[PDB]
Amino acid sequence: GSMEDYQAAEETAFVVDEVSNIVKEAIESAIGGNAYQHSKVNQWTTNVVEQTLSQLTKLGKPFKYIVTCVIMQKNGAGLHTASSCFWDSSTDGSCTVRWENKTMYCIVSAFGLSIGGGSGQSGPIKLGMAKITQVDFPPREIV
Amino acid sequence: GSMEDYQAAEETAFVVDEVSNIVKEAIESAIGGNAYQHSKVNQWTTNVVEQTLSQLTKLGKPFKYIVTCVIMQKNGAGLHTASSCFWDSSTDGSCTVRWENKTMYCIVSAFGLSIGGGSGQSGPIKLGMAKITQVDFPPREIV
């Protein structure tokens, strides 16, 4: 088809290295330098991404974003998650943020599916392949 | 843009009601009518979707499909999962498959992001909105 009739601007396209910082500046803004807390990270990773993931979509281009987040407990309660996702850097848009606590684990992951050619990053490019991403936190082992 | 210069065929486009059956015909093919088992469902939901999700992608159109699967245990081990996905039927492509066992839980979910106009389903259309989808299987309650 005649996609060549139009184009897209690389100056309005976002980058993974930017999105990976938008989450920190938004979390630390929500914290405001308050007292050191553990279970607060659970309400922060949810409350932040709630507006932040919406905001960074606007700092980039309009496309299908998604996120998934997994709140485990080191107290004794974990499971087998299997994620048929793929890592991409120059190929496509993907990002992720990992915030561990004293006895809790709060890990959020993001996939920004973009086919419009939004590229031009400052960092080096890396050729390779991607495969299935399983994630299992075993709370114990077999005796 | 000049997208109107080309088109897409609705006769090659898949439907959610079809994909929702491709999983059963593939699972029961892998079972072959063998002895009744519990932990087998875990190897079946993984092994099937491994080739089946690849196959139904070919029975439809070439696009970015993803799946996520969450294997819990009713023995005492569950967690807080939070999925910023959305349900769609006529708007976009989404499907999901739920296989519970005696003491185990095996739930797989799928998102088939398709903007090419692949529609024309046999079932009725339903207008509405979609929101954030949390998944929490509490193994106990607070005393």
From Swiss-Prot, chains A, B:
One of its GO terms (cellular component) is extracellular region. Keywords: Acetylation, Cell cycle, Cell division, Cytoplasm, Cytoplasmic inwards viral transport, Cytoskeleton, Dynein, Golgi apparatus, Host-virus interaction, Microtubular inwards viral transport, Microtubule, Mitosis, Motor protein, Neurogenesis, Phosphoprotein, Transport, Virus entry into host cell. Gene3D superfamilies: Tctex-1. One of its GO terms (molecular function) is dynein intermediate chain binding. Phosphorylated by BMPR2; the phosphorylation is abolished by BMPR2 mutations in exon 12 which lead to truncated forms of BMPR2 and which are linked to primary pulmonary hypertension (PPH1) [MIM:178600]. The phosphorylation status is proposed to regulate the association with the cytoplasmic dynein complex and may have role in cytoplasmic dynein cargo release. It is found in: Golgi apparatus; Cytoplasm; Cytoplasm, Cytoskeleton, Spindle. Expressed in heart, placenta, skeletal muscle kidney, pancreas, spleen, prostate, testis, ovary, ileum and colon. Expressed in lung endothelial and smooth muscle cells (at protein level). Residues 43-115 are annotated as: Interaction with GNB1. One of its GO terms (biological process) is nervous system development. Its main location: Golgi. The modification N-acetylmethionine is found at residue 3. Disulfide bonds: none annotated. Acts as one of several non-catalytic accessory components of the cytoplasmic dynein 1 complex that are thought to be involved in linking dynein to cargos and to adapter proteins that regulate dynein function. Cytoplasmic dynein 1 acts as a motor for the intracellular retrograde motility of vesicles and organelles along microtubules. Binds to transport cargos and is involved in apical cargo transport such as rhodopsin-bearing vesicles in polarized epithelia. May also be a accessory component of axonemal dynein. Belongs to the dynein light chain Tctex-type family. Homodimer. The cytoplasmic dynein 1 complex consists of two catalytic heavy chains (HCs) and a number of non-catalytic subunits presented by intermediate chains (ICs), light intermediate chains (LICs) and light chains (LCs); the composition seems to vary in respect to the IC, LIC and LC composition. The heavy chain homodimer serves as a scaffold for the probable homodimeric assembly of the respective non-catalytic subunits. The ICs and LICs bind directly to the HC dimer and the LCs assemble on the IC dimer. DYNLT1 and DYNLT3 compete for association with dynein IC (DYNC1I1 or DYNC1I2). (Microbial infection) Interacts with human papillomavirus 16 L2 protein; this interaction is essential for virus intracellular transport during entry. This is Dynein light chain Tctex-type 1. It comes from Homo sapiens.
